[PDB]
């Protein structure tokens, strides 16, 4: 996260760290959606152009974390993966369309002060909240700058951008399965996700029922926090039928 701030304790209790076993390193962000299911970006797991192809045994899930590097004794929980499920129409060849994957944990995680699931939006939530100018919140342990690494979980609040402005900022084809967020040059304020934050949640707090909903997943961007560029996020609601189908079957 570029130009964000340290998270408060328990501020994002659905935050998950995807952690490579060998070598030990941050793979990506992710989010807890029930005691058994974790949501992330497909490209965190599968990206042939970079020869990335992680199998279940290659990584661990770390939940309830604050510190990036510390083993948080009596606080964080470490879970192994039973199965990964990548969207069958994830487009890694071009633009990361449908950048979404689920991971089922081998055993349920116990909820605590530090560990709790986020809600997924329904059609109404999405129509009401996914509006240009409305702000969401992005969290992660990724790079502090485009060109180092944070001590603790970082957080930034960013407005959703009008679709024409998003399209006009890039040569990449933007689909209905994506949205963009970030400040414009003329707005003065700054902030973006960066390398290491992909797969992490973009959340919004409903003013109707005071619950947090995961509206986006950190997908991609061109550099980090550049003027006139915006972060691109997977549209969770648009892909919810696939989410439900996988959880219902598996």
């Amino acid at each position: 996260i570029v130009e964000g701030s340290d998270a408060e304790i328990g501020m994002s209790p659905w935050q998950v760290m995807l952690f490579r076993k060998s070598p030990q390193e941050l793979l990506c962000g992710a989010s807890l959606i029930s005691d058994r299911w974790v949501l992330t970006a497909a490209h965190c797991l599968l990206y042939p152009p970079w020869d990335k192809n992680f199998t279940e045994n290659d990584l661990l899930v770390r939940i309830g974390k604050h510190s990036r590097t510390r083993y948080e004794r009596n606080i964080e929980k470490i879970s192994m993966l039973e199965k990964i499920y990548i969207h069958p129409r994830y487009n890694w060849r071009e633009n990361l369309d449908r950048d979404i994957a689920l991971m089922k944990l081998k055993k349920p995680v116990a909820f605590s002060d530090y560990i709790h699931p986020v809600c997924l939006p329904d059609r109404e939530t999405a129509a009401s909240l996914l509006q240009a100018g409305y702000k969401g919140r992005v969290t992660g342990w990724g790079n502090l700058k485009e060109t180092g690494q944070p001590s603790v979980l970082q957080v930034v609040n960013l407005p959703i951008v009008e679709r024409p402005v998003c399209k006009d900022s890039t040569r990449i084809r933007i689909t209905d399965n994506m949205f963009c967020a970030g400040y414009k040059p003329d707005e003065g304020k700054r902030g973006d996700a960066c390398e290491g934050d992909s797969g992490g949640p973009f959340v919004m707090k409903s003013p109707f029922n005071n619950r947090w909903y995961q509206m986006g997943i950190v997908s991609w961007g061109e550099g980090c926090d550049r003027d006139g560029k915006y972060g691109f996020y997977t549209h969770v609601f648009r892909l919810k039928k696939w989410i439900q189908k996988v959880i219902d079957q598996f």
Binding site: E25, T69, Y71
Partner: peptide, 5 residues
């Protein structure tokens, strides 16, 4: 990263 038990 600190070692995990």
């Amino acid at each position: 990263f600190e070692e995990i038990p």
